[PDB]
């Protein structure tokens, strides 16, 4: 089979984590424009027939608990899974409102042996976040 | 058996090591472009080809504007990381 089976009863979940405002202890700027992103994504994946869930300003503890909880749902009738992370970041890292969390910790919940009702189904992670502090000056 | 890391796709907004850019009015360059390309092409193109169009749109149609010269006239390329084992069509 060359193409994923996308005709389950449901396309699947689209979890959108929209972190705009961060604790002063983090020194991180408020992410003006991210509400526009979150609304754009909600409408885009609605039109693709995903069950969209928007979450705003989650701590790193809340991000992990949300992902754990979602990975423990029964996805048997779902074709796929989508997670969108909008936040500050570093290489391998996404920020909760109060500090960093390893991306691997989030995605590990959905491993083929740990989320059996998504085994063999596409698991899509869309990550708007920095991955370091390098700048690309471009070439004319 | 299949690998436990199979069937993941990570659509990163930017290359490893780099900043990623966000416009205060229109949103991030990457999400703007991703939504535009999904709107235009999700009924016709395979997902990696949609994401390649996103790469081109971010790469060619955006350049930073900043009052800080250090951050001005900068560019961005997204980074598609695919452990998928099949083609993905949303229809």
């Amino acid at each position: 089979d060359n193409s994923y089976k996308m005709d389950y009863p449901e396309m699947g979940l689209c979890i959108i984590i929209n972190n705009k405002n961060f604790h002063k202890s983090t020194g991180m700027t408020s992410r003006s424009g991210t509400d526009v992103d979150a609304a754009n994504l909600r409408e885009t994946f609605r039109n693709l027939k995903y069950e969209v869930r928007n979450k705003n300003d989650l701590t790193r503890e809340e991000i992990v608990e949300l992902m754990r909880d979602v990975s423990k749902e029964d996805h048997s009738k779902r074709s796929s899974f989508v997670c969108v992370l909008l936040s500050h970041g570093e290489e391998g890292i996404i920020f909760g409102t109060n500090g960093p969390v390893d991306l691997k910790k989030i995605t590990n919940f959905f491993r083929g042996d740990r989320c059996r009702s998504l085994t063999g189904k596409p698991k899509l992670f869309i990550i708007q976040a920095c991955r370091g502090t390098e700048l690309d000056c471009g070439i004319e | 058996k299949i690998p436990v890391e199979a069937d993941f796709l990570y659509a990163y907004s930017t290359a490893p090591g780099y900043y990623s850019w966000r416009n205060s009015k229109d949103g991030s360059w990457f999400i703007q472009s991703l939504c535009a390309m999904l709107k235009q092409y999700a009924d016709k193109l395979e997902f990696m080809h949609i994401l390649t169009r996103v790469n081109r749109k971010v790469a060619t149609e955006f350049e930073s504007f900043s009052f800080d010269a250090t951050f001005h006239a900068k560019k961005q390329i997204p980074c598609i990381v695919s452990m998928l084992t099949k083609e993905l069509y949303f229809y």
Partner: peptide
């Protein structure tokens, strides 16, 4: 204007 994440 543009900001970095």
């Amino acid at each position: 204007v543009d900001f970095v994440d």
